[PDB]
Write an enzyme that holds these catalytic residues in place. Structure first.
Site, PDB file in Angstrom:
ATOM      1  N   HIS A   1       4.605 -14.085   1.434  1.00 56.79           N
ATOM      2  CA  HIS A   1       5.909 -13.537   1.226  1.00 56.79           C
ATOM      3  C   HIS A   1       6.298 -12.328   1.977  1.00 56.79           C
ATOM      4  O   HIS A   1       7.416 -11.860   1.831  1.00 56.79           O
ATOM      5  CB  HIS A   1       5.844 -13.463  -0.323  1.00 56.79           C
ATOM      6  CG  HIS A   1       5.330 -12.225  -0.988  1.00 56.79           C
ATOM      7  ND1 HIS A   1       4.027 -12.245  -1.370  1.00 56.79           N
ATOM      8  CD2 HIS A   1       5.646 -11.082  -1.028  1.00 56.79           C
ATOM      9  CE1 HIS A   1       3.867 -10.965  -1.704  1.00 56.79           C
ATOM     10  NE2 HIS A   1       4.705 -10.206  -1.486  1.00 56.79           N
TER      11      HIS A   1
ATOM     12  N   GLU B   1      -1.933   4.225  12.141  1.00 54.90           N
ATOM     13  CA  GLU B   1      -0.782   5.107  11.207  1.00 54.90           C
ATOM     14  C   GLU B   1      -1.390   5.727  10.105  1.00 54.90           C
ATOM     15  O   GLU B   1      -2.457   5.417   9.375  1.00 54.90           O
ATOM     16  CB  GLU B   1       0.218   4.427  10.932  1.00 54.90           C
ATOM     17  CG  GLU B   1       1.379   3.567  11.534  1.00 54.90           C
ATOM     18  CD  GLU B   1       2.279   4.674  12.182  1.00 54.90           C
ATOM     19  OE1 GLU B   1       3.351   4.268  12.637  1.00 54.90           O
ATOM     20  OE2 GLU B   1       1.931   5.753  11.783  1.00 54.90           O
TER      21      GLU B   1
ATOM     22  N   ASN C   1       0.913   9.003   8.709  1.00 57.60           N
ATOM     23  CA  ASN C   1       2.213   9.433   8.127  1.00 57.60           C
ATOM     24  C   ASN C   1       3.078   8.304   9.025  1.00 57.60           C
ATOM     25  O   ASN C   1       3.248   8.231  10.001  1.00 57.60           O
ATOM     26  CB  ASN C   1       2.806  10.890   8.566  1.00 57.60           C
ATOM     27  CG  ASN C   1       4.164  11.008   8.145  1.00 57.60           C
ATOM     28  OD1 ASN C   1       5.027  10.252   8.065  1.00 57.60           O
ATOM     29  ND2 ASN C   1       4.499  12.389   7.769  1.00 57.60           N
TER      30      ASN C   1
ATOM     31  N   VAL D   1       6.236   9.845  11.312  1.00 59.19           N
ATOM     32  CA  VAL D   1       5.799  10.977  12.254  1.00 59.19           C
ATOM     33  C   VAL D   1       4.954  10.201  13.292  1.00 59.19           C
ATOM     34  O   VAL D   1       4.005   9.676  12.930  1.00 59.19           O
ATOM     35  CB  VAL D   1       5.501  12.172  11.845  1.00 59.19           C
ATOM     36  CG1 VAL D   1       5.018  13.048  12.738  1.00 59.19           C
ATOM     37  CG2 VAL D   1       6.299  12.923  10.783  1.00 59.19           C
TER      38      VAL D   1
ATOM     39  N   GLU E   1      -1.455   6.095  17.065  1.00 64.74           N
ATOM     40  CA  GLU E   1      -0.585   4.889  16.761  1.00 64.74           C
ATOM     41  C   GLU E   1      -0.347   3.747  17.856  1.00 64.74           C
ATOM     42  O   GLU E   1      -0.450   4.335  19.040  1.00 64.74           O
ATOM     43  CB  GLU E   1       1.023   4.995  16.340  1.00 64.74           C
ATOM     44  CG  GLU E   1       1.203   5.835  15.125  1.00 64.74           C
ATOM     45  CD  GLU E   1       1.336   7.354  15.326  1.00 64.74           C
ATOM     46  OE1 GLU E   1       0.949   7.902  16.088  1.00 64.74           O
ATOM     47  OE2 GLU E   1       2.041   8.074  14.298  1.00 64.74           O
TER      48      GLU E   1
ATOM     49  N   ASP F   1      -0.816 -17.645  -0.995  1.00 65.83           N
ATOM     50  CA  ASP F   1       0.077 -16.518  -0.332  1.00 65.83           C
ATOM     51  C   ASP F   1      -0.823 -15.618   0.867  1.00 65.83           C
ATOM     52  O   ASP F   1      -1.117 -14.662   0.700  1.00 65.83           O
ATOM     53  CB  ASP F   1       0.393 -15.491  -1.450  1.00 65.83           C
ATOM     54  CG  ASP F   1       1.335 -14.420  -1.060  1.00 65.83           C
ATOM     55  OD1 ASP F   1       2.053 -14.345  -0.040  1.00 65.83           O
ATOM     56  OD2 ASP F   1       1.694 -13.436  -1.893  1.00 65.83           O
TER      57      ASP F   1
ATOM     58  N   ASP G   1      -2.348   1.162 -10.000  1.00 62.23           N
ATOM     59  CA  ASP G   1      -2.168  -0.159  -9.580  1.00 62.23           C
ATOM     60  C   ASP G   1      -1.608  -0.071  -8.068  1.00 62.23           C
ATOM     61  O   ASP G   1      -1.277   0.806  -7.652  1.00 62.23           O
ATOM     62  CB  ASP G   1      -1.280  -0.713 -10.502  1.00 62.23           C
ATOM     63  CG  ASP G   1      -0.991  -2.501 -10.560  1.00 62.23           C
ATOM     64  OD1 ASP G   1       0.037  -2.756 -10.897  1.00 62.23           O
ATOM     65  OD2 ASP G   1      -1.897  -2.947  -9.594  1.00 62.23           O
ATOM     66  N   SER G   2      -1.151  -1.185  -7.522  1.00 65.01           N
ATOM     67  CA  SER G   2      -0.695  -1.478  -6.270  1.00 65.01           C
ATOM     68  C   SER G   2       0.683  -1.528  -6.546  1.00 65.01           C
ATOM     69  O   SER G   2       1.096  -1.893  -7.863  1.00 65.01           O
ATOM     70  CB  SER G   2      -1.358  -2.540  -5.307  1.00 65.01           C
ATOM     71  OG  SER G   2      -1.626  -3.864  -6.399  1.00 65.01           O
TER      72      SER G   2
ATOM     73  N   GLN H   1       5.203  -2.363  -5.045  1.00 68.34           N
ATOM     74  CA  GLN H   1       5.965  -2.978  -3.961  1.00 68.34           C
ATOM     75  C   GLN H   1       5.841  -1.895  -2.860  1.00 68.34           C
ATOM     76  O   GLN H   1       5.766  -0.713  -2.908  1.00 68.34           O
ATOM     77  CB  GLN H   1       7.584  -2.698  -4.260  1.00 68.34           C
ATOM     78  CG  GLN H   1       8.548  -3.297  -3.432  1.00 68.34           C
ATOM     79  CD  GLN H   1       9.852  -3.151  -3.843  1.00 68.34           C
ATOM     80  OE1 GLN H   1      10.077  -2.452  -4.929  1.00 68.34           O
ATOM     81  NE2 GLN H   1      10.606  -4.059  -3.331  1.00 68.34           N
ATOM     82  N   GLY H   2       5.585  -2.489  -1.748  1.00 70.30           N
ATOM     83  CA  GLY H   2       5.572  -1.785  -0.340  1.00 70.30           C
ATOM     84  C   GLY H   2       3.954  -1.963  -0.016  1.00 70.30           C
ATOM     85  O   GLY H   2       3.465  -1.827   1.287  1.00 70.30           O
TER      86      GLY H   2
ATOM     87  N   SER I   1       2.397  -4.855  -0.897  1.00 69.55           N
ATOM     88  CA  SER I   1       2.095  -6.383  -0.831  1.00 69.55           C
ATOM     89  C   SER I   1       1.499  -6.452   0.820  1.00 69.55           C
ATOM     90  O   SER I   1       1.689  -5.821   1.738  1.00 69.55           O
ATOM     91  CB  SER I   1       3.311  -6.998  -0.817  1.00 69.55           C
ATOM     92  OG  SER I   1       3.888  -6.468  -1.956  1.00 69.55           O
ATOM     93  N   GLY I   2       0.582  -7.637   0.977  1.00 70.08           N
ATOM     94  CA  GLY I   2       0.174  -8.014   2.172  1.00 70.08           C
ATOM     95  C   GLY I   2      -1.131  -6.960   2.618  1.00 70.08           C
ATOM     96  O   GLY I   2      -1.799  -7.522   3.580  1.00 70.08           O
TER      97      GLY I   2
END
Ligand SMILES: *[O-]C1=C(C2=[C][C]=[C][C]=[C]2)[C]=[C][C]=C1C1=NC2=[C]C(C([N])=[N+])=C(Cl)[C]=C2[N]1
Ligand SMILES: [Ca+2]
Ligand SMILES: [Cl-]
Length: 223
Positions: free
Chosen positions: A40, A52, A54, A57, A62, A84, A171-172, A174-175, A177-178
């Protein structure tokens, strides 16, 4: 990640940020040219950002590489979120080092009680939105199948498992995910869904990667 702590720069070298002009999902590097994330989180125009800490920045380390193709699992069901998982092939291979490294795929599934490490740049508030600049970490155990099904009756398939704290608070979200759920150095889960974040009796549900190893290997081998 709600109730977690700052990982420390580059201490989770397999964590990637999927970027389309902002961070929208996490992922895990499994070899120098492929990343595993959740179905998703699929979209076009994805830039994979490795090394990564930060995400706002450029601090050094990176590597920004474009995805050449994303392969969503053919049986992915957007309504149930069953299967998923998505594989992303990078346009060029990443230079691996101590700050950018891949994580191993499991050879067996993990048992309840296994303690795992979940990380990401997702929301840190359960009630409201506060996104961090650096990577957050959370240590959480895999719950038993009975506790998971009792929490989400009728919604857990054999390709999902719950990890977390029934008391809420950690908990984990939104953001996240994956991104990765690593246990004893093996990638065992992918942050997939849950009811809210850090709510009591509503743990996170993760894609059970042990059920997809042959599929991941066969797919990578033919692409
Ligand atoms: O992952 C998301 C998203 C989302 C998905 C893909 C691209 C952009 C945004 C939107 C809204 C919520 C979530 C999300 N919440 C959430 C909670 C939990 C939980 N309670 N543990 C988990 Cl595992 C995963 C997700 N994703
Ligand atoms: Ca950065
Ligand atoms: Cl059930």
């Amino acid at each position: 990640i709600v109730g977690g702590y700052t990982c420390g720069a580059n201490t989770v070298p397999y964590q990637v940020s999927l970027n389309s002009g902002y961070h929208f999902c996490g992922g895990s590097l499994i070899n120098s040219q492929w990343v595993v994330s959740a179905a998703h989180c699929y979209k076009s125009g994805i830039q994979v950002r490795l090394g990564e800490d930060n995400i706002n920045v450029v601090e050094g380390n990176e590597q920004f590489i474009s995805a050449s193709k994303s392969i969503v699992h053919p049986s992915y069901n957007s309504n149930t979120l069953n299967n998923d998982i998505m594989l992303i092939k990078l346009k060029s291979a990443a230079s691996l080092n101590s700050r950018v490294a891949s994580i191993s795929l499991p050879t067996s599934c993990a048992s309840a009680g296994t303690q795992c490490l979940i990380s990401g740049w997702g929301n840190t508030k359960s009630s409201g939105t506060s996104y961090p600049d650096v990577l957050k970490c959370l240590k959480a155990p895999i719950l038993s199948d009975s506790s998971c099904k009792s929490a989400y009756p009728g919604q857990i398939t054999s390709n999902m498992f719950c990890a977390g704290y029934l008391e809420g608070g950690k908990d984990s979200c939104q953001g996240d995910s994956g991104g990765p759920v690593v246990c004893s150095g093996k990638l065992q889960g992918i942050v997939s869904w849950g009811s809210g974040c850090a709510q009591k009796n509503k743990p996170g549900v993760y894609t059970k990667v042990c059920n997809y190893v042959s599929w991941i290997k066969q797919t990578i081998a033919s692409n």
